[PDB]
Design a protein around this ligand. Structure first.
Ligand SMILES: *[C@@H]1O[C@H](CO)[C@@H](O[C@@H]2O[C@H](CO)[C@@H](O[C@@H]3O[C@H](CO)[C@@H](O)[C@H](O)[C@@H]3O)[C@H](O)[C@H]2NC(C)=O)[C@H](O)[C@H]1NC(C)=O
Lengths: 218, 218
């Protein structure tokens, strides 16, 4: 048994997206397909269900009219169409197999990520940072690496060939106005930071952008 | 739609401690067949949910015996005999009794440990920011616990609330401590006008807010 969902989608506000869930290894037409929305913040919200064998469909009050379910019996696939995409609709959507009263949601799709934004693909602008000059130097100090002005996700930050993996603290991306950003700081010995070379790598597969900006003492 | 509520919102419990998650329904969710259909799902970060329990008590195949359930017409609870690293995640209660079927609010599970004081830091902008025509002021707080953290952007005696970014990191594994990076985007026309920039952060461990500042005039 396996539910395969479509790829990630990025669409402009007001448009409509159609994501698909393909089930194999079981009687596709005899299991309800449950659609679940997980906003990045928190919470699982069931959108509705569809029984591919028939046309029966149910929707939660919050999504009645926002989502429409269609299923293809010939190709073991089910579709959910979202209309009038706002910024709230950006989330990860899951498809699950369910048989009411007998079997629970034992198999889930990998999850499809939908992002509603007006921006276009933009390379990152990595601005490495160092401790301020007006700051006492002690045994332990924190480094600084900043990535901003990039879109869409994701962006991976790593040190030179994983030179210093443990002890690093990356942070989730956030939107200033429209573009995403990211921060990453690591702790290194005060005697090793100036002597040894420390640098943060940046990779943006969406923009096919790779950057490498070493940070030197002020 | 039947409303399902979970308590507590967060349940910090150290390793090996008993864990109790309670779920309640806005209506009775019993069924005629002698069973009431309630299921418990667990989601790890960056992963699809996983079934743990169904029909209140019946335990899914392949799940550790430590998990157990119990309840009645409108009150149900989940029990974990012992907590482990894998157990960390979010737990949801799902009702499969009345159409439409709804998820619980989600009960994040956490491991409590010896709280560590935050290690605050402040990093002024870099030459690249000046050349681009911008000024980014970011505050770092690493390896702190618990979530009782507040950050105030007081600058040269002025408290500024606009353009403040809230971005913290989920609990790690090696250290099991959080982090909190706050940023303030400044323009060149405004960046140089002010003189002193400070990052006031308050934590439970230290009642007096920790102060870290730098002066533009140098
Ligand atoms: C529709 O009606 C049928 C027949 O009355 C119901 O089947 C019966 O369901 C109960 C509860 O699931 C079964 O009892 C349970 O059996 C399991 C497995 O042996 C056991 O672990 C439980 O402790 C309990 O004894 C019962 O065997 C089963 N009967 C038959 C003939 O299959 C069915 O539940 C009804 N479905 C709905 C949606 O109302």
């Amino acid at each position: 048994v396996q539910l395969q969902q479509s790829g990630a989608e990025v669409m402009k506000p007001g448009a409509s997206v159609k994501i698909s869930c393909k089930g194999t290894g079981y009687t596709f037409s005899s299991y309800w397909i449950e659609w679940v929305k997980q906003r990045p913040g928190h919470g699982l919200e069931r959108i509705g269900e569809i029984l591919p064998g028939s046309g029966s469909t149910n929707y939660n009050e919050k999504f009645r009219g926002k989502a429409t379910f269609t299923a293809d019996k010939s190709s073991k696939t089910a579709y959910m169409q979202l209309s009038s995409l706002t910024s709230e609709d950006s989330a990860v959507y899951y498809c699950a197999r369910y048989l009411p009263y007998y079997y629970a949601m034992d198999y889930w799709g990998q999850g499809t990520s939908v992002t509603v934004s007006s921006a276009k693909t933009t390379p990152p602008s990595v601005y490495p940072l160092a401790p301020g000059s007006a700051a006492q130097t002690n045994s332990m100090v924190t480094l600084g690496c900043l990535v901003k002005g990039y879109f869409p996700e994701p962006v991976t930050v790593t040190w030179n060939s994983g030179s210093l993996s443990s002890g690093v603290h990356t942070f989730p991306a956030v939107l200033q106005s429209d573009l995403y950003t990211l921060s990453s700081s690591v702790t290194v010995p005060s005697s090793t930071w100036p002597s040894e070379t420390v640098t943060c790598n940046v990779a943006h597969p969406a923009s096919s952008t790779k950057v490498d900006k070493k940070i030197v003492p002020r | 739609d039947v409303l399902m509520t979970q308590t507590p919102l967060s349940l910090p419990v150290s390793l090996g401690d008993q864990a109790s998650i309670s779920c309640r329904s806005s209506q009775s969710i019993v069924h005629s067949n002698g069973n009431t259909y309630l299921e418990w799902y667990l989601q790890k970060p960056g992963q699809s949910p996983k079934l743990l329990i169904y029909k209140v008590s019946n335990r899914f195949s392949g799940v550790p015996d430590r998990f157990s359930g119990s309840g009645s017409g409108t009150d149900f609870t989940l029990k974990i005999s012992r907590v482990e690293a894998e157990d960390l995640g979010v737990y949801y209660c799902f009702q499969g009794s009345h159409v439409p079927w709804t998820f619980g609010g989600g009960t994040k599970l956490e491991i409590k440990r010896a709280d560590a004081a935050p290690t605050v830091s402040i990093f002024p902008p870099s030459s690249e920011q000046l050349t681009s025509g911008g000024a980014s002021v970011v505050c770092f707080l690493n390896n702190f616990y618990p979530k009782d953290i507040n950050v105030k952007w007081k600058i040269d005696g002025s408290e500024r609330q606009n353009g403040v970014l809230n971005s913290w990191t989920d609990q790690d594994s090696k250290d099991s401590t959080y982090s909190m990076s706050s940023t303030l985007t400044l323009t060149k026309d405004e960046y140089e006008r002010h003189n002193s920039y400070t990052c006031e952060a308050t934590h439970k461990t230290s009642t007096s807010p920790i102060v870290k500042s730098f002066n533009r005039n140098e």
